[PDB]
Design a protein around this ligand. Structure first.
Ligand SMILES: CS(=O)(=O)N1CCN(Cc2ccco2)CC1
Length: 460
């Protein structure tokens, strides 16, 4: 029974509006409705992993698990296994996997983050799950961010609190937040970003939606504009949106957007918006392809429509050699030439690097770099040819070329990371000096860059 080198992953997000679901929700798991939809010829083919995020979910965990599992069994005739379920208030994540994957999945983590303070603490936040699938780390975040058209900055703040404080994945990766801990990270939810057009334009917006003309709406979508100004979700991907806004509908039809201010809305307008989203971030040069992104048309119990997205995702096997794991393989090495970090900091500590990777027995600390002043004001930290030679546990190029090295640049004074990044070992050549590059972030914001050259020796 061969190990897979690809799997498919379903992501769903649905703000249920505190209402029980209708009796049939299969269109959601089949990626049928509006947008980029899944071919009918695939309907009986199960995804490997299903990850369901709900918000305003009124059900118990038991009640929702029975609906989900019976739904998938009806579609596929497979009885899925529950990997994890975690709920914060009415925000929930369920991970289901095909039974054949049970002994490929390990290191399951769950966590939540509550956003806001006082007034603003008590219903928004995020839940998440991570696990290993053979050699591949997977992370999943379902967030319900702050509502309201004039609160995009609050949403951005909620995002940074969630990536800082959600504790998923390998705790030994201490310098790294969730945006660096996983081969593949999926972040979805009722992100609550709105179409920022004047209230007076509500009927015009509705007209455009009926004509399936989304371009002049998407150009005012706050998530796309905030991402283009690098205010949120830096280095994440989203498929093109080709479905109608998923909020705010009159319940029990999809014929009507309910946008006008009401006591029930706190006298706020809810112009039609793409509240409900799926984004991802994968390590460099790992296969990830979105194969569907859309909304259902026939699930009408909520004022939101469910959103689906599906992905092909590259995975690797749990590699054993005669040498590693449990020792090094002297036929392998990773070297760095002419490396330097460019940092945006105004501070003047010395800095050192840490290299973290599951291809190493443990993380490696460099010597301190040499600080110089850049020509446009910057701090440049030069390592030259001074970085330690890294000794991977396995030298076989079929393993090593699939690995990644996380880098943190840390203050000598405080041992605090000033920037984190990731280098792929999927090189064009071995035993050859080749340029490498990563942006550096801290708390998910850009703090600098790391560049130089690598020389990778494998057993071939
Ligand atoms: C919607 S956007 O924020 O304006 N924007 C457009 C170009 N860019 C491409 C890119 C480069 C690195 C990662 O992704 C995606 C982000």
């Amino acid at each position: 029974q061969p190990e897979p080198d690809m799997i498919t992953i379903f992501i769903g997000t649905w703000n249920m509006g505190n209402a029980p679901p209708p009796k049939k929700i299969t269109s959601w798991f089949l990626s049928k409705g509006q947008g980029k939809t899944r071919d009918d010829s695939a309907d009986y083919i199960p995804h490997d992993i299903y990850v369901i995020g709900t918000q305003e979910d009124p059900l118990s965990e038991k009640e929702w698990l029975e609906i989900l599992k019976h739904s998938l069994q009806e579609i596929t005739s497979v009885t899925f296994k529950t990997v994890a379920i975690h709920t914060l208030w009415n925000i929930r994540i369920v991970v289901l996997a095909k039974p054949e994957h049970e002994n490929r999945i390990s290191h399951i983590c769950t966590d939540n983050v509550k956003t806001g303070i006082a007034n603003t603490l008590g219903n928004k936040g995020a839940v998440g799950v991570s696990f290993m699938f053979n050699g591949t780390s997977l992370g999943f975040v379902n967030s319900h961010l702050t509502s309201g058209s004039e609160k995009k900055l609050r949403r951005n703040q909620n995002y940074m609190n969630i990536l800082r404080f959600l504790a998923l994945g390998d705790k030994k990766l201490s310098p790294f937040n969730i945006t660096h801990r996983f081969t593949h990270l999926f972040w979805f939810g009722d992100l609550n970003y709105r179409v920022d057009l004047p209230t007076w334009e509500a009927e015009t917006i509705i007209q455009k939606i009926k004509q399936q003309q989304y371009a002049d709406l998407l150009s005012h979508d706050q998530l796309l504009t905030e991402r283009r100004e690098q205010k949120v979700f830096l280095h994440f991907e989203e498929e093109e949106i080709t479905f109608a806004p998923t909020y705010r509908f009159e319940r029990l039809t999809r014929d009507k957007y309910a946008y006008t201010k009401q006591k029930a809305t706190g006298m706020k307008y809810n112009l039609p918006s793409w509240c409900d989203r799926v984004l991802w971030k994968s390590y460099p040069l790992v296969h990830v392809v979105c194969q569907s992104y859309g909304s259902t048309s026939d699930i009408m119990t909520s004022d939101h429509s469910p959103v689906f997205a599906t992905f092909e995702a590259g995975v690797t096997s749990q590699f054993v050699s005669k040498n590693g794991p449990g020792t090094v393989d002297s036929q392998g090495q990773i070297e760095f030439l002419r490396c330097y970090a460019t940092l945006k900091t105004k501070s003047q500590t010395k800095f050192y690097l840490e290299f973290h990777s599951s291809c190493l027995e443990s993380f490696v600390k460099s010597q301190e770099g040499e600080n110089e002043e850049g020509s446009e004001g910057e701090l440049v930290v030069k390592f030259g040819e001074t970085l330690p030679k890294l000794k991977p546990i396995i030298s076989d190029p079929e393993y090593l070329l699939d690995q990644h090295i996380l880098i943190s640049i840390k203050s000598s004074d405080s041992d605090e990371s000033y920037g984190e990044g990731c280098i792929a070992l999927r090189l064009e050549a071995t035993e050859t000096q080749l340029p490498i590059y990563t942006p550096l972030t801290h708390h998910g914001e850009l703090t600098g860059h790391f560049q130089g050259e690598i020389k990778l020796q494998t057993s071939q």
